[PDB]
Design a protein around this ligand. Structure first.
Ligand SMILES: [Cu+2]
Ligand SMILES: [Cu+2]
Ligand SMILES: [Cu+2]
Ligand SMILES: [Cu+2]
Ligand SMILES: [Cu+2]
Ligand SMILES: [Cu+2]
Ligand SMILES: [Cu+2]
Ligand SMILES: [Cu+2]
Ligand SMILES: [Cu+2]
Ligand SMILES: [Cu+2]
Ligand SMILES: [Cu+2]
Ligand SMILES: [Cu+2]
Lengths: 279, 277, 278
């Protein structure tokens, strides 16, 4: 275990493509290429100061939109019908997201930077709030890193969408694998009608911007359990198995009927030899 | 720039009336026939004392209960403490506030500063379920010396399934000009949890809703879960980095969105116009 | 006089714990047979302490001990999948450890174990402990950091589904203090529902200790807090500070919940023992 890799300064202009596609069984998803849509959608990362142009195409037969949390966008990128920012069937649009660093305002106040654990999702499918689109799966993680932020080995996204994790059948996970000592990042997003409490066995994080204590000064409560509600996003990083060891470490919503009905997954933490004790 | 709050400590006095409004609604007001939902904004600087000369203008008992401020049990505003007000009655409710400081035990005593609220504790039940439903609630802000002052303050209450007891899809909308420093007080009441969301803007989840400086670890959010009696606030620079537009705020619980808990933060260009609206 | 503070930890400690049936379908944890309570006994450790829990299952159904926030190996997870439950009549030793904060090799700052936590059954009735938790097997755990301020008294309030501590509606509990006492509350939530915890006449910081660290701590100061199953938090107040003696209500603020009896009293006495208006 050596010194942490950290995020560099941003400010570069970046470009991707995104498609909205019908998937099997009435689901809909975002993808970086036609035929490539996933639920959750592709993870988008940026460094504070980066600009992102998303060349967007709706391949479906209903209007769809891309709406993002926390980042800078003009009203023309709001991704709503009210702002005439949605996309007709077979149409395209360029959505532009911007980000900025923190800094002293001319009025003496300190302007918060864009950095955080955020998300994007449809605002027009089935209702003008994207209720149907979100149900069907159009949602995905966005991470904006501040310069100096600690980088993980792997990032995993867990979305509680109504009664499902990542729109999966009950009791299907997903499961994520790590090796003891790995620095693992989780993005935790909630959607739909219901409140949840996210819980992770054998690990804990700080309730704050990065999910990690900035040092001894940081008062933030340290927690393994966090209540969340539709459109909430937070994130954190743990050292897999730290002080605990290898094992199949459950994560799950802690609402009792929710865990019983199956919103449950495994953080599978292997010994260096690839074996998991007691699993 | 950035006007700030002065040091507190004055003794202050206001009149407050509970009154019936249209259709089974009830509200607090600063003058008879002037009641509003939400009630009048009460602002204090830490150390201030507030004497409230309270008159119940209605035909049923009512009370005034406040969160976070200093009050003796006789100002609790409950039946249980015999602090409520009979129909037609008057009472003086007293709220006090204090600054932070070191205690004799060595700990750090938190001051009164923050985003708080008041509301009835006796109407319809001994928890004020009927009164709160009917609209007796209002915002209270206590400022610490040095706190940044806004240009305008707006109160948004999620009360059960309504915003400020309005009919669905009625707003309210609030207007601003790009660059204005705008304060929001966000209160929740009733039966249900909600998630408050504002397009195009973000705030720090902390006492003032703003980062204190480069060392403040607080998560920066546009979406916040809230339950009955939850109280928070923040300030934004209107349109900062995003420009003008009709910027939606709304509950993010999907059916609540769909059922009309929605409003607009209307941010005008200097010329008074809103793009896309 | 200066507050008492928590000492450095690092001792190896040991206790016995029993799971046992109580009246009317209730189940509880206890320090001695016949002694089970709901909530179960308070367990208090200093960071670095190790705790060996010598556990006996007194009941006819398998039961388990699962804990939040503390370090434990998978063999102390307390779940069926890890084969850490305890057969009826059986015994097992569960081991919880704790650690202090400090720098990692990678240069980051490792969070310590300190906090307000809880333990409960993971096993009875479903493999999430739904029956067990409903029956009352849950309890508070506090892990203190060296230097943390210590109270005169600690009280545990658990919102479990629609009850406070599995008590009948409108039964409290009520807690007594004298004006000026330093009183600690551990607030835990279990079951199916979100709640909001509210305390009249007092307030705390929403943060690790429930108290502001000093003039630079940004944490919101609150009298009202939303919580959901398995959330835990705690705080300490000076009873009656700036307010005075009185019967100070606490309750869930969801209106139907308070109307239906999730309510209790923080009874703050004058030094002579009397409470005004009560
Ligand atoms: Cu929206
Ligand atoms: Cu859930
Ligand atoms: Cu657990
Ligand atoms: Cu959203
Ligand atoms: Cu109350
Ligand atoms: Cu809502
Ligand atoms: Cu949004
Ligand atoms: Cu209240
Ligand atoms: Cu579990
Ligand atoms: Cu409740
Ligand atoms: Cu209250
Ligand atoms: Cu648990």
């Amino acid at each position: 275990m050596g010194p942490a890799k950290t995020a560099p300064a941003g400010g570069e202009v970046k470009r991707i493509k995104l498609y909205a596609e019908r998937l099997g069984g009435g689901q809909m998803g975002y993808g970086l290429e036609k035929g490539k849509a996933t639920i959750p959608g592709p993870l988008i990362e940026l460094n504070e100061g980066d600009t992102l142009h998303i060349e967007f195409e709706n391949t479906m037969d209903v209007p769809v939109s891309l709406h993002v949390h926390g980042l800078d966008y003009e009203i023309s990128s709001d991704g709503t019908k009210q702002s005439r920012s949605d996309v007709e069937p077979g149409g395209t649009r360029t959505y532009t997201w911007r980000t900025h660093v923190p800094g002293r305002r001319a009025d003496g106040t300190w302007r918060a930077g864009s950095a955080g654990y955020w998300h994007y999702h449809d605002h027009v499918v089935g209702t003008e709030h994207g209720t149907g689109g979100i149900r069907n799966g159009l949602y995905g993680p966005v991470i904006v890193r501040r310069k100096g932020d600690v980088l993980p080995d792997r990032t995993h996204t867990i979305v509680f969408n109504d009664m499902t994790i990542n729109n999966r059948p009950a009791h299907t996970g997903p499961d994520f694998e790590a090796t003891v000592g790995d620095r693992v990042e989780f993005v935790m997003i909630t959607h739909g009608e219901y409140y949840h409490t996210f819980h992770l066995h054998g690990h804990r994080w700080a309730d704050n911007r990065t999910g990690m204590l900035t040092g001894p000064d940081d008062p933030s409560q340290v927690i393994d359990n966090k209540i969340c509600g539709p459109a909430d996003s937070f994130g954190f990083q743990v050292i897999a198995g730290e002080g605990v060891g290898a094992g199949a470490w459950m994560y799950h919503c802690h609402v009792q009927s929710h865990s019983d009905m199956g919103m449950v997954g495994l953080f599978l933490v292997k010994k260096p030899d690839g074996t998991i004790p007691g699993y």
